[PDB]
Structure 1
Amino acid sequence: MLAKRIIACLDVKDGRVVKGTNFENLRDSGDPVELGKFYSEIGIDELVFLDITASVEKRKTMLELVEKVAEQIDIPFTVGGGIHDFETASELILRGADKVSINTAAVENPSLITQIAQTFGSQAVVVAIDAKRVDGEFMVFTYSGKKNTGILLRDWVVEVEKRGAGEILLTSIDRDGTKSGYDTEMIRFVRPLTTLPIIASGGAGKMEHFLEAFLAGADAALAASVFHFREIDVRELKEYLKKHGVNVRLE
């Protein structure tokens, strides 16, 4: 549908939620599987798990996470963090993930988008784009924000859709980590350039920020610590959005 989605992002490392949560009701407030299940039960529409485990155990660790998450939830989930090639993406989808997120590897080899899409469908391929204003232009950054690629956001969005991606996870480096709001200027910039769903990421601090993101043209809104630390309640968020005319899924 044209229903707007609320997505929780769980940063994970060695099978734990990085920085934990304030959910004292859980058996283990830092267990990403139990946390993901909890979120599915309280109204989150999809999950994104981003792993930062050391290379040696990373492959096994991501596969174990996917297997364990898949048995507990029925809502869509994406896995990402250091997916560099088709075989890695393939194993993760087969083990249970609905989608994979790719970022630096896609920029370095855009054919990777097409390669994954040809087997798993475009809907399986989320391209995460991290962008920042530099000298008055929106530029694409790789390596967790460390590298200005010199590629314009405008050009890369178009290329990503051409290559067969299914969704764009758009993170503003200028808002990420803050609580001042989503980068609606950046969302509005991207919206006319692509037909793909856009997941807004970075800057959420209060319920109103979600409304603003949707008005800007996002199809989904992603957040992490605002949910994990109970600054925003998911059901209350959905109530609020529905009240103000946004098409959310609200049972």
Structure 2
Amino acid sequence: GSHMPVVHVIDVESGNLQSLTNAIEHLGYEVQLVKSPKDFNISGTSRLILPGVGNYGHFVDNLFNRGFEKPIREYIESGKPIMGICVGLQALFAGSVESPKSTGLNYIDFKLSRFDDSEKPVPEIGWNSCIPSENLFFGLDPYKRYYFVHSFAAILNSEKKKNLENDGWKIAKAKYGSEEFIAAVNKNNIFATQFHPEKSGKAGLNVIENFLKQQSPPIPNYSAEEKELLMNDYSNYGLTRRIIACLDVRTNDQGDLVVTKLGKPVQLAQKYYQQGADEVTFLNITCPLKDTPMLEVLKQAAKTVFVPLTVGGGIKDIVDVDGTKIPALEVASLYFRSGADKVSIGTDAVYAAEKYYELGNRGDGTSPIETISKAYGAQAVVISVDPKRVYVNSQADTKNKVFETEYPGPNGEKYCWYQCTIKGGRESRDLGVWELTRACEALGAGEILLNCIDKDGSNSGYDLELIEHVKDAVKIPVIASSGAGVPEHFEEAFLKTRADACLGAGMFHRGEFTVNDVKEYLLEHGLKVRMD
């Protein structure tokens, strides 16, 4: 309470706050959560952090509803250090197009807009860099990567950058595709980042430490060889080749949690993080909702794993042990507050998509995809697709969209579509992958986890045509999954397809290769990867 520096963190009791708290404590500070304006006074606060997550309006409304506007302004007026993270940075602006009627602190007199999806996938999900500048601050290093996860940003042009310049603002810029936007801002005692430092590994922890210690250390003295290797070449729109490590979570005979048919999933996640994983996905496949074992795994993993965590399995409307009807939104909220950054929807995604087409290509606003994305944004919803190839002689043989394949079927069929399955692949549905992804994308999904039942655990590579087929269908990031066995497979997916990321389960779990082994190979072949 006074034996270490206290850091006040504003808590609107929504989203993942575990990572930020753990990151601050890991730096040797004590965290004091401020859920109400009554929980903190100006003179008794030396370090204030305004963490934001989800939909702009859902955050700003909640924040101002609690009466935080004046306290925040009075704190900023006191001249003491404040750090805004994600929506914490967006709140400094006039508002956002994500929530038209919502307002902002208006320190920067313009609104955040949506990235152009005509040239790249929106939301931006991945590791981007700050463009080299003379006015960088708090240790922001152009040769390092930070994690961005957003659809809206403060998009720049000459006029805006100049007004901000003359206004006394220091701007850390970043580019996604052909669009330049604000990655971070700094003026007097105000600091804010569009990226999540608590999710950016060591590079991220350094940014937090630099703010808490109020220092702008010089960037390491890199050689012309190191710079040329670490610089952003703007391949894959400026995002590094994202390597995702995934693990299954099952319950054995005794009731304990294991990854092979509650410390094992936790320790493996820590290992994956220590060995270079850009993301860790937990597939829950294992009792009251509050006491769910998977929630505790997230909590434990979130203590040392400073990269985004995804959880999938059973995210839908449920009937708890006591009979209480808990909507999918509340289930996802529980997982988020427990350490998860994104939730994966499989079975309920196929249902929602079928319903979508029956209603004449519209949603009724009740599906997990719709409610979760409206509260936490599209970047918080992942669709887990579990497809299988079905051959046909022509488009006339099915209502589902087909494509011409390079690999003829058993009877010489030159066309095929991919059929969706539910409940761990135990049941098929008369819905194609083309129809499923497009539907879910419309309902609000922000990313597609594209598995392939035929390639699952085969270590023979990814289903390249499937990847390209889905990339033709949607404008949201698509993750290549199922089939990864060797580093060459990742390279193949990244060069021969438009895959926005690569996921691996078996190969990492077998210790055959580590995430770093895959990264070393990609780096050796000229691809950009996160190395921290």
| Same fold at TM > 0.5 | yes
1:194, 1:59 → 2: CA distance? Answer: 37
**What's the offset of the Cα at 1:125?**
0.6
Q: Does 1:101 align with 2:356?
A: no
Query: What residue number does 1:9 align with?
Result: 246
Compute the RMSD of aligned alpha carbons: 2.0
Identify if the C-alpha distance between structure 1 residues 181 and 116 changes in structure 2 by more than 3 Å, giving closer, same or farther.
same
**What's the offset of the Cα at 1:46?**
0.4
Matched ranges for 1:83-162 at <5 A: 83-84=315-316, 85-110=328-353, 111-135=367-391, 136-162=416-442
The answer as to whether partners of 2:245 and 2:279 remain within 8 angstroms in 1 is yes
2:290, 2:419 → 1: CA distance? Answer: 29
The answer as to whether partners of 2:249 and 2:265 remain within 8 angstroms in 1 is yes
**Given residue 461 of structure 2, which amino acid in structure 1 is its aligned partner?**
G
The answer as to whether partners of 1:239 and 1:250 remain within 8 angstroms in 2 is no
Q: Does 1:50 align with 2:279?
A: no
Deviations 1:183-221 (A, max 9, x none): 111101111222211111111111111111112111111
**What's the offset of the Cα at 1:56?**
6.2
Matched ranges for 1:206-217 at <5 A: 206-215=486-495, 216-217=497-498
Higher relative contact order (CA 8 A, sep 6+): 1
The answer as to whether partners of 2:250 and 2:260 remain within 8 angstroms in 1 is no
**Given residue 239 of structure 1, which amino acid in structure 2 is its aligned partner?**
E
The answer as to whether partners of 2:315 and 2:368 remain within 8 angstroms in 1 is no
**Structure 1 stretch displaced more, 131-140 or 71-80:** 131-140
Query: What residue number does 2:272 align with?
Result: 39
Q: TM-score, normalised by structure 1?
A: 0.90
2:438, 2:308 → 1: CA distance? Answer: 25
Query: What residue number does 1:238 align with?
Result: 519
Higher fraction of helix? 1
2:437, 2:284 → 1: CA distance? Answer: 24
For residue 506 of structure 2, the aligned residue among 210, 222, 225 is 225
**Given residue 417 of structure 2, which amino acid in structure 1 is its aligned partner?**
E
The answer as to whether partners of 2:273 and 2:307 remain within 8 angstroms in 1 is yes
**What's the offset of the Cα at 1:60?**
1.4
Query: What residue number does 1:61 align with?
Result: 293
| Larger radius of gyration between Structure 1 and Structure 2 | 2
SS at match of 2:451: strand
**What's the offset of the Cα at 1:79?**
0.6
SS at match of 1:242: helix
Deviations 1:70-126 (A, max 9, x none): 122110000111212222112111222101001101221353211101111111111
- In structure 2, the gaps of 5 or more residues are 1-127, 129-238, 317-327, 354-366, 392-415
The answer as to whether partners of 1:80 and 1:101 remain within 8 angstroms in 2 is yes
**What's the offset of the Cα at 1:250?**
2.2
SS at match of 1:31: helix
- In structure 1, the gaps of 5 or more residues are 21-27
Q: Identity across aligned pairs (percent)?
A: 46
1:13, 1:240 → 2: CA distance? Answer: 32
**Given residue 156 of structure 1, which amino acid in structure 2 is its aligned partner?**
L
Query: What residue number does 2:6 align with?
Result: none
Identify if the C-alpha distance between structure 1 residues 58 and 230 changes in structure 2 by more than 3 Å, giving closer, same or farther.
farther
Deviations 1:18-56 (A, max 9, x none): 228xxxxxxx9x611122112111211000011111x66
Q: TM-score, normalised by structure 2?
A: 0.44
For residue 18 of structure 1, the aligned residue among 250, 255, 259 is 259
Query: What number of residue pairs does the alignment pair up?
Result: 242
Deviations 1:160-185 (A, max 9, x none): 11111111000011111211111111
Identify if the C-alpha distance between structure 1 residues 86 and 59 changes in structure 2 by more than 3 Å, giving closer, same or farther.
farther
The answer as to whether partners of 2:243 and 2:502 remain within 8 angstroms in 1 is yes
**What's the offset of the Cα at 1:57?**
7.7
Instruction: Give structure 1 regions of 4+ aligned residues with deviation exceeding 3 angstroms.
Output: 55-59
SS at match of 1:109: helix
Identify if the C-alpha distance between structure 1 residues 96 and 46 changes in structure 2 by more than 3 Å, giving closer, same or farther.
same
